[PDB]
Every structure is written in structure tokens, then in C-alpha cells.
């Protein structure tokens, strides 16, 4: 599947859905915490 | 005055000099096209009639390049059962 | 992981936190591993940055059949990002499954006690990977 | 008087002489461009008409170079469970 990227709106769309999708999966690795220590921060991506 | 310096806005300089060694070299039918690699500029030394031609070509080649995200999927389904 | 670098315009530069492993060719030769990031950025007008990025994430794996094996994750692309905005370069969203049941032909599909005749294997696996800049 | 010495303010001298061997060499259609490496200066020996051209080119190439911090992230998430 090719996908051309025009401007900052296109990389906004694709890079936003990939970046916030993977960050969202790390949030699903944050709520689903470790079995031993709840007081340990998971590696999470930055805000924006 | 005689020679000028063009700052390329979307392309590398060495590619443009590798193209433009061929345009002036028979367009004269002297000329100097040299590319400052560290500072992103090619230098045209030409008479006034050739200068508008090469200026027009540099104006037509310094263009925004689009970018393509390619996503290739792979599916493999197997099934094996022997009695 | 997030390496970083600081170049000038149009001046290539790289980075490494790896090792040097003796790789034998016949003639032992030193081969570099580890997180490499070789960029050559160019500043385009409109404050856009064109980069020639040749990244690599190598890692020494064991096994050691005839010599040591590696694991590379390299890529050599050329992107055009904005002034401070992220762009996705590459990636891999692996996803597997699996099943290996081993019955006994007639007394294997008993709905009640047939379960203690089959050696039901399974394997679920999923692995994501991304490279941003 | 005849020849002059330019102190480059933002660029190396050997790059500028590697460019400017090509500009004067057909701009004459003698000239000497030599670069003092230890003292950051190239030396132009040229007539008065060529001197303003090469002076203008050196004035247009001695420019402030911007610098870019590149930060590349790497994300790897795995999950493996077999029963």
C-alpha cells in the first residue's frame, strides 16, 4: 500500500496515528502494570 | 555582477552541477558551474544571455519533492494434519 | 531508545554506543555493532529539513554455530521533515499465532474426557517496532 | 595594492580555493588563488575588474551556517505467550 504525503497535514495524519497508536499501546502497558511494583514508571513516549 | 551565486532551496548542489556541466557545454555553441558543498550553493559564471537560460533551468528544477510511505503486508496461513 | 546528534548544515556526522566484536573471515576482522545514527541534514527553505539517515541497531546474539551471530535493524532512507515535527521513518508490526494439537483418532473428540488425550500446544506472539525522528 | 588578502569569517579557506579555482579560470576569458591554511585566509591575485567579481563572490559565500539537532526515537514493544 503506497501512501504519498503532501504537507504537514499528511505527516500530521500518518505520523499522528502511528505515534499516538504506539504511545497508546505503551499506555496499555502502563495501565496493565507490572505484577510486582506498581510504583515503577513504564517507558512512555513524550506528550506531543 | 558578471557571475552570480544561487542558493538552492530544495535540492543538493552536486546533483545540479552534475546536470549543468552538460547544458552550458553545448549551449555556448567560457562558462563555469561550481558547487559549494558546505554552504548549499552553486556558482554560475556565464554571459548575460546564458545566465537567464541557466537561471530559468535552476528555477524549474528547485522544486518541492513529495514523499511516499510504503506499507507492504505479508500473510502466511498454514494447515497440516496427518493420520 | 533515543540517540541525538548536533551537526552543522550539510556536514555528515554519526554516533555509536556499540562494541567491537572479532568476526573471523577465513582473517579476523573487527566489526562494529550497537546503536548507530549517521545523518547528513540539509536545511531547505520554509524551515524544512532534508536528512539522509543511515541508522542501525545491532546486538550480539549467541548461539555461536561456527561464529557469533548478530541482530541488525538497520535502515537507509531519506526523509523531509518539518521544523520540529515528528515523522515516522520505518517500522515492523509483526504478529503471529500457532496451534499444534495431537489427538488419538477415535477417542480424541470425546466432549467430556477427550481433553485428557490431546497434547494441545499453542503459541501467541506479537511484536511492534518503530523508528521516529 | 594589486593583490589582496581576505579573512574568511565563517568558512574554511581550502573549500573556498577548491571552488574558486574554477571561477577565475574561465572568468579571465593571470590569476592566483592561494589559501593560507594556518591563518584562515585566501589570497586573491587578479586585475581590478576580476577583483570586484571574486570579492563579491567571497562576500556572498562567507555566510552564517545554521546547525541542526537531530533526535531519533526507537520504540520496541513485544509480547509472547504460549500455552
Task: Report the 3 state secondary structure along chain C.
Answer: CCCEEEEECCCCECCCCCCEEEEECCCEEEEECCCEEEECCEEECCCEEEEEEEEECCEEECCCCCCCEEECCCEEEEEEECCCCCCEEEEEEEEECCEECCCCCCCCCCCCCHHHHCCCEECEEEEEEEEEC
What are the phi and psi torsion angles at D54 (to 5°)? -65, -30
B80 DSSP β-pair partners: none
Which residues lie closer than 8 Å to D74 by C-beta, 6 or more apart? C1, C2, C35, C57, C130, C131, C132
How far apart CA C23 and CA B27 sit, in angstroms, is 54
Query: Where chain C is broken, by preceding residue (C–N > 2.5 Å)?
Result: 26
**Residue B3 near chain D (CB below 8 Å):** yes
B6 DSSP β-pair partners: B42
How many C-beta atoms lie closer than 10 Å to residue D62's C-beta?
15
D3 touches D43 (CB < 8 A): yes
**Residue C3 near chain D (CB below 8 Å):** yes
| Closest CB to B31 among D26, D60, D65 | D26
Which residues lie closer than 8 Å to C51 by C-beta, 6 or more apart? C39, C40, C41, C42, C78, C79, C80, C81, C133, D70
Instruction: Say what angle helices B13-27 and B48-61 make with each other, to 10 degrees.
Output: 140
Give DSSP secondary structure letters for A8-39: HHHHHHHHHHHHHHHHHHHHHHHHS--SS-SS
What are the phi and psi torsion angles at C48 (to 5°)? -105, 150
What are the phi and psi torsion angles at C69 (to 5°)? -110, 160
Q: Which residues in chain D have Cβ-Cβ distances shorter than 8 Å to A22?
A: 75, 77
Resolution of this deposited model, Å = 3.3
How many C-beta atoms lie closer than 10 Å to residue D55's C-beta?
14
B67 touches A4 (CB < 8 A): yes
How far apart CA A20 and CA A27 sit, in angstroms, is 10
**Is the CB of B32 less than 8 angstroms away from the CB of D52?**
no
How far apart CA C95 and CA D79 sit, in angstroms, is 10
Amino acid at each position: 500500500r503506497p501512501t504519498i504525503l503532501r504537507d504537514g497535514m499528511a505527516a500530521d495524519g500518518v505520523s499522528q496515528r502511528k505515534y499516538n497508536y504506539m504511545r497508546a499501546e505503551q499506555i496499555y502497558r502502563d495501565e496493565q502494570g507490572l505484577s510486582l511494583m506498581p510504583h515503577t514508571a513504564q517507558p512512555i513516549l513524550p506528550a506531543q | 555582477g558578471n557571475s552570480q551565486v544561487f542558493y538552492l532551496k530544495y535540492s543538493k548542489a552536486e546533483d545540479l552541477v552534475d546536470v549543468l556541466k552538460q547544458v552550458s557545454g553545448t549551449l555556448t555553441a567560457v562558462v563555469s558551474i561550481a558547487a559549494s558543498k558546505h554552504s548549499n550553493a552553486l556558482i554560475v559564471t556565464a554571459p548575460q544571455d546564458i545566465m537567464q537560460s541557466l537561471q530559468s533551468v535552476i528555477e524549474q528544477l528547485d522544486i518541492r519533492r513529495a514523499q511516499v510511505h510504503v506499507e507492504a503486508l505479508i500473510v502466511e496461513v498454514a494447515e497440516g494434519s496427518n493420520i | 531508545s533515543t540517540p541525538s546528534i548536533t551537526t552543522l548544515d550539510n556536514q555528515e556526522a554519526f554516533f555509536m554506543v556499540g562494541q567491537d566484536v572479532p568476526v573471523l573471515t577465513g582473517t579476523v576482522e573487527r566489526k562494529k555493532v550497537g546503536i548507530m545514527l549517521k545523518v547528513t541534514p540539509q536545511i531547505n527553505e520554509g524551515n524544512a529539513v532534508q536528512m539522509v539517515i543511515e541508522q542501525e541497531v545491532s546486538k550480539v546474539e549467541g548461539q555461536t554455530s561456527l561464529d557469533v551471530v548478530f541482530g541488525e535493524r538497520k535502515l537507509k532512507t531519506t526523509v523531509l521533515a518539518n521544523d520540529g515535527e515528528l515523522i515516522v521513518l520505518g517500522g515492523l508490526m509483526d504478529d503471529q499465532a500457532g496451534e499444534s494439537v495431537a489427538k488419538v483418532p477415535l477417542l480424541g473428540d470425546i466432549p467430556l474426557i477427550g481433553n485428557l488425550f490431546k497434547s494441545t500446544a499453542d503459541k501467541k506472539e506479537k511484536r511492534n517496532l518503530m523508528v521516529f525522528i
